[PDB]
Amino acid sequence: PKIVWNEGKRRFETEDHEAFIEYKMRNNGKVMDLVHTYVPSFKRGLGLASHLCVAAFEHASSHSISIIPSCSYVSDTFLPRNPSWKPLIH
Ligand SMILES: CC(C)(COP(=O)(O)OP(=O)(O)OC[C@H]1O[C@@H](n2cnc3c(N)ncnc32)[C@H](O)[C@@H]1OP(=O)(O)O)[C@@H](O)C(=O)NCCC(=O)NCCS
Numbered sequence: 001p002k003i004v005w006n007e008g009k010r011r012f013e014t015e016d017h018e019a020f021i022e023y024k025m026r027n028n029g030k031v032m033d034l035v036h037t038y039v040p041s042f043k044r045g046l047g048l049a050s051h052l053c054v055a056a057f058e059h060a061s062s063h064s065i066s067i068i069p070s071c072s073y074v075s076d077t078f079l080p081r082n083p084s085w086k087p088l089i090h
Pocket residue numbers: 035036037038039040043044045046047048049050051071072073074076077
């Protein structure tokens with residue numbers, strides 16, 4: 001699954017632009033707020049949103065940025081299933 005970083009749309013997304021996680025940067029680029037995840041119906045229940053989240057966390061982590069998990073997929077599903085990411089959380 002090729003996920004890319006589209007800075008201009010503030011998202012990490014599949015190459016076809018169809019599935020994405022959108023963020024807003026806060027505190028002068030120090031905090032990435034994950035605000036909305038969307039996977040289209042035909043591609044759901046297969047782990048795609050999880051891979052989108054991993055792309056965003058790895059990005060935040062390599063750049064020394066912390067995360068706000070505003071999006072309910074992130075706080076309610078991804079983090080509980082992946083607690084080793086919780087130190088990234090603002
Ligand atoms: C939420 C969404 C991105 C998940 O995509 P996905 O690729 O199907 O997600 P994954 O396969 O990684 O994980 C599926 C898990 O998502 C969880 N989930 C589904 N909807 C959720 C929601 N709105 N909030 C918290 N988690 C949700 C379920 O627990 C599901 O677990 P299961 O394996 O027991 O069915 C996708 O269903 C979607 O685009 N929904 C509409 C937009 C939305 O409500 N986004 C959340 C707020 S930003």
